[PDB]
Amino acid sequence: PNRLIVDEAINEDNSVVSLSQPKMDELQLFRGDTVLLKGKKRREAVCIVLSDDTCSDEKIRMNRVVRNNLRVRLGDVISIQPCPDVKYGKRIHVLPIDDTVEGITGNLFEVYLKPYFLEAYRPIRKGDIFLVRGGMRAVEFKVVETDPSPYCIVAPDTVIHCEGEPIEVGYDDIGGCRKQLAQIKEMVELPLRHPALFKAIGVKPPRGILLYGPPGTGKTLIARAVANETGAFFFLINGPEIMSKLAGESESNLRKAFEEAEKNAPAIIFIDELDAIAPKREKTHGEVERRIVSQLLTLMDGLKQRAHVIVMAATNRPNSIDPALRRFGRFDREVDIGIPDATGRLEILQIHTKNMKLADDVDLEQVANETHGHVGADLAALCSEAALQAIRKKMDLIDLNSLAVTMDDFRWALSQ
Amino acid sequence: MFVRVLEKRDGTVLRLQQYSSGGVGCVVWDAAIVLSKYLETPEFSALSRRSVLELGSGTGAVGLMAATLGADVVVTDLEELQDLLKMNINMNKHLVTGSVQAKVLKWGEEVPSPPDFILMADCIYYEESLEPLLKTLKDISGFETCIICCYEQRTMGKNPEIEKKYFELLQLDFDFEKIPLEKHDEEYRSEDIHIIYIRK
Numbered sequence: 001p002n003r004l005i006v007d008e009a010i011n012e013d014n015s016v017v018s019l020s021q022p023k024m025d026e027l028q029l030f031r032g033d034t035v036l037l038k039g040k041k042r043r044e045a046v047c048i049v050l051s052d053d054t055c056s057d058e059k060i061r062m063n064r065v066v067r068n069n070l071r072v073r074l075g076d077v078i079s080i081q082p083c084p085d086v087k088y089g090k091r092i093h094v095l096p097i098d099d100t101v102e103g104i105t106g107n108l109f110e111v112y113l114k115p116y117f118l119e120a121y122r123p124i125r126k127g128d129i130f131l132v133r134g135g136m137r138a139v140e141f142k143v144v145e146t147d148p149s150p151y152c153i154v155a156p157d158t159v160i161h162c163e164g165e166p167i168e169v170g171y172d173d174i175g176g177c178r179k180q181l182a183q184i185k186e187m188v189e190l191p192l193r194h195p196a197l198f199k200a201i202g203v204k205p206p207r208g209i210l211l212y213g214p215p216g217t218g219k220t221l222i223a224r225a226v227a228n229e230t231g232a233f234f235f236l237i238n239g240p241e242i243m244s245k246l247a248g249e250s251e252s253n254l255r256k257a258f259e260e261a262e263k264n265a266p267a268i269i270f271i272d273e274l275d276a277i278a279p280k281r282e283k284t285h286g287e288v289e290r291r292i293v294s295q296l297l298t299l300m301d302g303l304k305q306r307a308h309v310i311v312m313a314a315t316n317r318p319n320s321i322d323p324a325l326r327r328f329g330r331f332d333r334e335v336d337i338g339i340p341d342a343t344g345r346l347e348i349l350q351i352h353t354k355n356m357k358l359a360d361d362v363d364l365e366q367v368a369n370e371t372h373g374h375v376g377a378d379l380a381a382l383c384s385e386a387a388l389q390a391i392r393k394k395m396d397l398i399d400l401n402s403l404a405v406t407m408d409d410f411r412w413a414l415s416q
Numbered sequence: 417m418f419v420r421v422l423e424k425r426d427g428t429v430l431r432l433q434q435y436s437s438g439g440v441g442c443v444v445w446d447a448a449i450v451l452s453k454y455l456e457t458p459e460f461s462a463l464s465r466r467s468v469l470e471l472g473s474g475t476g477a478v479g480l481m482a483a484t485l486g487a488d489v490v491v492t493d494l495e496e497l498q499d500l501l502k503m504n505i506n507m508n509k510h511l512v513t514g515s516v517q518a519k520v521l522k523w524g525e526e527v528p529s530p531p532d533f534i535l536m537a538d539c540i541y542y543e544e545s546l547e548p549l550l551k552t553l554k555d556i557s558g559f560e561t562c563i564i565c566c567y568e569q570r571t572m573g574k575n576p577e578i579e580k581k582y583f584e585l586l587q588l589d590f591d592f593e594k595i596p597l598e599k600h601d602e603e604y605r606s607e608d609i610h611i612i613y614i615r616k
């Protein structure tokens with residue numbers, strides 16, 4: 001209910017997240033309310049909430065600064081809750097990210113921090129990374145210490161302090177597709193284990209592999225387990241995140257990936273959501289479409305027959321891909337990752353129950369027998385839902401340590 | 417800006433600068449690679465000391481390739497492309513064995529003595545590829561001009577009807593043949609990119 005789907009910000013201020021008014025009614029939240037947001041890797045953020053007409057009810061708009069702070073991507077899920085008692089900080093300790101101040105000199109407070117905090121009453125959290133644009137260069141800063149202990153509102157009396165400059169998966173975690181896993185393991189073994197045997201043998205190595213499927217089939221898991229277990233560097237590109245950037249910010253992203261894939265070769269570059277980058281758009285005379293596909297086809301034709309860099313990309317719509325990708329032996333292999341059958345679900349459920357103490361009465365095959373249109377992502381959620389119901393049961397035993405999960409807990413999860 | 421290397425059969429590399437920001441002619445298209453690599457085929461050769469006009473030159477890819485095989489080529493595109501065309505000429509001056517020069521030529525307008533070849537790559541894609549382009553092609557072309565047109569068969573929205581009409585108009589002043597896929601470069605070829613020849 002307070003779980004929301006991360007969407008792009010139109011309100012590109014650091015301190016502002018946006019929900020729909022119907023959602024804001026269901027949580028009894030008002031404009032200008034300080035809210036606490038929870039994301040992945042135990043990361044938290046403090047924002048002001050606002051209305052936005054152009055926003056699906058299940059989603060939250062938040063800029064790239066906050067998304068990085070929450071360690072979350074577009075399409076991921078965060079929690080939101082009211083944060084009423086944020087007091088005014090007395091003094092904050094703030095430094096700049098060295099990546100961003102290299103080769104600049106000047107009064108960092110006069111150029112950046114003063115006009116950023118000035119009469120804004122910003123909420124800040126220890127460990128935040130914030131970007132301040134303007135000033136011939138955008139510098140990113142970090143909150144190392146607050147005067148309230150966590151949390152603070154940077155009010156005029158708050159004093160600012162600035163000195164210095166700061167800076168494994170595997171095959172046994174993949175179930176339900178023991179076939180397609182071997183088919184990728186095989187496309188990739190020779191080019192990542194024995195690259196030079198391709199000039200010698202005289203054969204053209206794979207450069208791109210398309211993984212087809214619906215969301216949740218585990219296509220990112222497959223790719224990362226192939227990279228960790230053949231000894232390959234792994235570089236993830238998220239389709240909508242790179243597209244969210246300015247052309248030029250993304251061009252720098254895309255280059256960096258191939259730069260690092262060759263600096264660390266053998267490497268696998270993985271492109272989640274290929275059709276965010278390379279749609280089957282029409283083509284007319286205009287300045288208005290950015291030429292990211294061409295950058296990508298240029299970087300991939302430039303890898304040539306070295307075979308130490310393989311590029312995998314996944315999509316939910318194969319007939320929706322720019323045909324240029326499938327020519328000149330760029331993307332000329334494709335494996336399909338579907339819903340698992342009954343045996344596949346059971347495979348997945350043993351993987352997700354791996355570090356959960358299971359009751360004697362647990363029949364994981366019955367759970368499997370009743371999970372049809374389910375993909376691995378839904379089977380994962382079903383297990384955590386069951387362990388959550390186990391925790392809520394020990395929670396009710398305050399009627400006056402660890403946990404144990406029963407088939408009733410699963411029966412609760414199968415009924416949402 | 418990101419640089420396409422375009423490898424030649426003899427080992428030298430053409431390098432084409434590309435811009436992720438401008439109009440459609442700021443990146444190298446695959447019909448450019450197909451055409452360029454086809455000029456290098458054994459059955460083609462024969463460009464040396466010959467006159468080449470390239471329309472829709474964009475990045476200069478095809479015209480520059482012909483400039484390195486011994487031809488005297490003029491790469492033409494709109495005013496927005498002249499600085500790229502010139503930048504890309506400077507990038508490859510060390511490989512030009514005939515001659516190359518950038519000029520402005522918007523289709524449907526006029527600016528010599530008829531050229532030997534006219535080379536086009538991926539020029540047939542919107543309104544101006546129709547009445548204005550055939551005007552320019554009907555003009556520049558002598559009777560012994562070999563116009564070579566390379567383009568990607570596209571399937572989306574406005575692109576297939578432009579390709580349909582464009583051949584419904586080419587019959588009015590020109591005879592054409594499509595050269596078979598197997599005369600294309602062995603590797604840089606694709607069932608959906610067409611090299612077609614024109615005369616008259």
Ligand SMILES: Nc1ncnc2c1ncn2[C@@H]1O[C@H](COP(=O)(O)OP(=O)(O)O)[C@@H](O)[C@H]1O
Pocket residue numbers: 173174175176177213214215216217218219220221222314348351375376377378380
């Ligand atoms: N076949 C599977 N085997 C094991 N776990 C899976 C499988 N499919 C999905 N999962 C779980 O779902 C999560 C997300 O899957 P992901 O790799 O994002 O799939 P996709 O890229 O197709 O959306 C994984 O991190 C994993 O916990």
Ligand SMILES: Nc1ncnc2c1ncn2[C@@H]1O[C@H](CSCC[C@H](N)C(=O)O)[C@@H](O)[C@H]1O
Pocket residue numbers: 285439440441442443444445446447448449471472473474475476477492493494497521522523536537538539544545548
């Ligand atoms: N009416 C017109 N007159 C002159 N050039 C035109 C034109 N309409 C489009 N163009 C040019 O036609 C080119 C088509 S894009 C193809 C560029 C080049 N063939 C390549 O493959 O790399 C663009 O460079 C654009 O600048």
